[PDB]
Task: inverse folding
């Protein structure tokens, strides 16, 4: 029931909708290269200009699978039927399976690159799953599972940042930088035990989610507009003298009424700094011990917090979340930017009173009774992020809409088993191979649908909102090119944000 | 009991006749190519001249098996013994099996094309079976199972028409064409789950038929000739004055008698239009919303209904069903055309009275009490067609003699599993392979034979009606060439139509 | 809608012979057949329904 | 079916009991389904000519009038000896006993 | 049943434009342009509906 | 007269029906009449008691 | 595919003000002015013939 | 908000905010009618603090 000429598993695909859950099944083709000659090599990268932003990182022979994005697990069909028709959803559990491996040898005689098969060569597969190693992954990075199947999936090399390159530069000195340099972890996935596989074998992995609900609902009014304008209130407002206009007290009108609920937090002050590349944030979170030397400017010490705004109506282009939707270029295109969902949550503002008229309050920290909703997700967003382990933390939502969880799905690592070749002087000289296989990620989504007492139709994602594109304009947004290709969504609101439709009474 | 050097199944062939059923078994050799580089590519084809007839279609990496024709499942021997000896027959059920796969790699160093074996490569096999995807297939198209075994069977690429190319051209304008463009399905067989197979595996599929009986019987008289000429009738005919000749009434003679039964429907009016290629029908069924622009003429909007005639004695060559019997050419040869079966059903006519003599009624729509029989089938006809799902329909028989059914046998799709190769820039660069295997289609035919009280011999298909052909004339119609080949039947009535023999009393 | 029926044309020919106004028949090509439409066809009366 | 070619073949209603000549009146539009909105166009010799009257013919396939929120649900099919296929062109569901 | 579904193509567009068909179309003389027969193209195909 | 869709569906509920579903037909109806009043009109002239 | 949004819809009332199905000032029940508000069936979803 | 869907000249921002607006009717829910010889009682529980 097994062997070389027996496929391990079949292709799996398609979404299956029910009332209480949804099952998305995706199979794709991947390949794995040698990645570094199998060495490790801590680089000390540096951008050169403008710098410093010096991260040294590390390299591994290992490659990894990144399943984190919605557009990987949903078709634009299936993810419309989800956005529409359902209010809450969260991933319940994941099941990954790797099978139908091939492992072929590359032959370079010069040109024509034979690509004969190699039967006895193995493939290492390690699923971390306890997060004992640096997480890799991270949101918004390309390498995710291809949005469109039948596309081969080229895995990416695994690396991590062992420490800040500044702070252990180290230059002249230090014993501060030297103590920071001399403490530095070095992780090797070979310390753990894992599985090697030949072409007749397979590996499967299971994952469960604690996670949180993704709320697809719209608020038609702010929390401050909840009241009956027809009813008089017993309340009094006192006003100073100014400016002649004798001070007086009077009861607040029925149409106006004090709210107990505050604008959500966000930081609208400052603005981005520096040339392209380098690092541009407007908020740079970092660490700078005393006696640390550290030379080059603030960029190398710190990371940067973007988006700062969260809620609060960013007031500028550079506070919005913006991505390119395609790995190829460019300056101005294509870039999706972002829009207000038209929900009355989000898009908030503060405006402290002063004396005449008002002035916007740029920095809104946490305050009691603040109420907001998380960034409206879209098909192109990452699903989860990893919440870093720490003693203390405030309330957790990231401003990119990801679901932070203690243990995300463990990263699955893979590399080509090293086949050496003999030599007189015993030199590295590995044998050149790659592998190809099929990963099937089947995730179950805990899902809840809606019932409303609204009389009116509300809103849906039609796809009559959508663009046209191709060599010639011709065929529509998600379809295919001439020739080509996969026509990308050009703007919002195609990509179909959550929270723009349905409704909820606050 | 399995492996690389173990054949999965053996060759199967031959027909087995009984009284209540017939079993035809056919095994053939096929091969499958890469088909598009594995991409999709919606073409926007267009004929160029004369046009417009603009269909854009789509392409898939997938290939498919088309079993729809009689000459694939019957030998001219076995299908004579069926035509003769039996009155009704219909397919009861189908069983398809794919096995003995090979999957070899093509090696181009330049010339000499090595063709080494590749053991671990897979093959995707998907049987739709619910008709969730566009049907492919369609009657009368070449690609069907080879009529003659020992012939390798080259599968054809799967594609479908997502929409009309006119009506979403779109030119300048529109929001009508734009709404039609922006709604357009894109189907991917990878959304469904299917099986991948290596060289030691196999797949089998079962199908059942609702279908309908194919009636092989001849009517020796029209339904209007059913009566006893010896018996007087009590009936009266009144005739106007004209034209002197005083109006009078008299009883209709015994030899003449009014029939309650009407000529079957058919459209003999108009005639074909336009140059070769383009589209030539004489009836163009299409759809043209208002405000649709659409530029080029009626061809691009509509398909065309041929044959229009059905019954009714086409009166012209261009209303007859005509096919070339061979994939190679030509203008005038060989082309089978068609003939009246000599059954008194079909070959009908209407001729409304007018005043003096008569005038042919060209368009005969549905009318009560119409009675006809379906187009006489032949060995070369398609078996079934797919009846499109719709709210309402009239009585269903297609005029090409196919059996329309709600669910035909589901199309079986197959393609080569994509094996990528590494590259520095991560470019498509698949590995070049093909596959070869054996399909065995075993279909059971529900069959009913005849008993007649006729004294006289009736008629059979002899094969003394048949032609001569080859390099030199030499050997007969269905045999083989010198050299060569498979000698084709040149005309009717070789190919042995149904309904030309036996008999039935109406 | 009004039920079906054929009110057009009208009867043709002398008494005896055949007089219908709709003559349903069969006429293959190359059939010779000499005498006129009456011998080929029967006739549908009543056409009206 | 058949793409009415004129305003006066379309289904049109006033949506309100109060008036009027031109308002408000909903008229009707093609659903953009490829069923409905049909046409025939017999060949003739050069170019084509629209076939105005399309009676029943074998192998005709269409779908019923696209319903809307404002349509009637059912109609009563009158009792009779014989009838052809039953769909009313206003989209109602004819049934023996409503 | 009240069927809420849309057809993206007419029933006449159901076929594979990539596949050649074995069928023949005959055309009269007119009008000079000698009468001829040829096989119908892959992109065009007779519909039974 | 209960015959119309806009009587039985809100534009909300009838969108959620149009969307999300392909076939639908009415299965059964239950009508109930209750809370009757039956008042007398009194015309003395104006003020209609 | 396609859905009935209600972003296709009109505006109406004494003053234009509030939307299609809502209510007037004063008033009323604002009526849908045209197609495709009233949300026809068969304009959305899809089916393979 | 009356601002934000005023709407004045323009907009498609205010118009999209105007065109999305709920309209609630307590008649959509089912409730009780009472005559002078009847009564209604209701219970409530508190999570509270």
Result:
């Amino acid at each position: 029931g097994s062997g070389v000429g027996i496929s391990t598993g079949g292709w799996v695909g398609g979404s299956y909708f029910t009332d209480s859950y949804v099952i998305t099944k995706n199979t794709r083709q991947f390949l794995v290269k040698i990645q570094n000659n199998h060495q490790y090599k801590t680089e000390s990268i540096i951008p050169s200009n403008g710098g410093g932003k010096s991260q040294r990182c590390v390299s591994t022979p290992w490659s990894y699978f990144n399943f984190n994005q919605y557009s990987s697990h949903f078709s634009p069909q299936d993810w419309q039927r989800l956005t529409n028709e359902y209010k809450r959803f969260r991933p319940k559990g994941m099941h990954v399976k790797i099978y139908n491996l091939q492992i072929k040898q590359i032959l370079s005689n010069g040109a024509d690159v034979t690509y004969n098969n190699d039967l006895t060569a193995g493939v290492h597969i390690f699923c971390d799953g306890e997060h004992a190693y640096p997480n890799a992954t991270h949101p918004w990075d390309e390498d995710v599972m291809p949005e469109l199947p039948y596309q081969t999936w080229y895995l990416f090399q695994y690396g991590y940042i062992p420490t800040i390159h500044e702070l252990a530069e180290m230059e002249d000195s230090n014993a501060v930088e030297k103590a920071i340099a001399l403490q530095i972890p070095f992780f090797m996935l070979e310390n753990s035990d894992h599985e090697v596989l030949r072409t007749g074998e397979s590996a499967e992995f299971n994952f469960n989610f604690d996670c949180e609900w993704i709320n697809n609902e719209r608020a038609f009014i702010p929390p401050g507009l909840m009241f009956n304008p027809l009813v008089p209130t017993r309340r009094a407002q006192y006003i100073r003298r100014n400016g002649n206009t004798q001070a007086s007290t009077s009861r607040v009108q029925p149409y106006a009424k004090p709210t107990s609920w505050m604008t959500g937090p966000g930081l609208l002050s400052a603005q981005r700094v520096g040339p392209a590349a380098s690092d541009t944030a407007a908020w740079m979170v970092g660490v700078d011990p005393e006696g640390a030397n550290i030379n080059s400017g603030r960029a190398g010490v710190s990371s940067g917090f973007d988006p700062p705004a969260g809620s609060l109506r960013p007031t500028d282009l550079e506070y919005k979340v913006q991505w390119y939707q395609t790995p190829a270029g460019t300056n101005n295109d294509g870039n999706i930017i972002s829009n207000p969902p038209l929900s009355m949550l989000r898009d908030q503002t503060l405006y402290r009173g002063n004396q005449t008229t008002y002035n916007l309050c740029s920095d809104v920290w946490m305050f009691p009774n603040q109420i907001w909703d998380r960034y409206p997700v879209t098909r192109e967003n990452p699903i989860w992020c990893k919440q870093p382990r720490s003693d203390k933390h405030t309330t957790i939502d990231p401003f990119d809409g990801s679901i932070a969880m203690d243990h995300p799905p463990g990263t699955i690592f893979i590399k080509m088993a090293k086949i050496p070749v003999p030599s007189n002087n015993n030199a590295d000289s590995y044998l050149n191979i790659y592998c190809t296989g099929q990963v099937s990620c089947e995730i179950v989504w805990e899902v809840e649908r809606y019932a409303t007492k609204n009389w009116r139709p509300e809103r849906r994602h039609t796809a009559l909102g959508l663009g046209i594109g191709g060599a010639d304009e011709i065929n529509p947004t998600y379809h295919v090119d001439k020739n080509g290709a996969y026509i990308q969504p050009t703007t919002w609101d195609m990509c179909f944000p959550v929270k723009t439709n349905i409704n909820k009474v606050l």
About this structure: The radius of gyration of chain F is 20 Å. Chain F is about 25% helix and 5% strand. Chain F touches chain G at residues 11, 14-15, 18-19, 22 (CB under 8 Å). Residues 8 and 27 of chain F are 14 Å apart (CA to CA).
